[PDB]
Write a protein that binds this ligand. Sequence first.
Ligand SMILES: CCN(CC)CCCNC(=O)Cn1nc(C)n2c(cc3sccc32)c1=O
Length: 140
Amino acid sequence: WDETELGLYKVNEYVDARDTNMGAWFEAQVVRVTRKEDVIYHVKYDDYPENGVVQMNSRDVRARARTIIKWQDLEVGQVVMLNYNPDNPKERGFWYDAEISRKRETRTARELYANVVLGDDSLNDCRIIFVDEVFKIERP
Ligand SMILES: CCN(CC)CCCNC(=O)Cn1nc(C)n2c(cc3sccc32)c1=O
């Protein structure tokens, strides 16, 4: 609990924060920044006030996703943030980081596969439904 004015993100800044347990990214806001780069972010989630204030490692906080990578610009090997539902893969889910693994296209059909990063481990060759909603990851 050593308040710091250093660190990429500032108090009141609207960010993306990663839930440690699920590995998914949620819109959050920096409420406090402490130390022991390796600064600790204290965040509150925009749509989850009931989750309180959570201490985050600096790797679990980044600038909010804003740019959609269009289908034509998606490439095998790109690390992106996309929507996936691990329990119900055909349904809408949460925003996870993923490595694009396969990209297929016919005249009337498109197929996107990715290696999806979850709570701790990778889920290889997931079939991605939301091909037009793939986000570029904001990097400093
Ligand atoms: C084991 C039970 N299975 C099947 C029913 C579900 C898997 C476990 N539970 C979940 O995914 C539920 N869940 N949902 C939301 C929105 N958030 C969670 C943490 C955070 S931090 C911000 C939002 C958010 C969270 O834990």
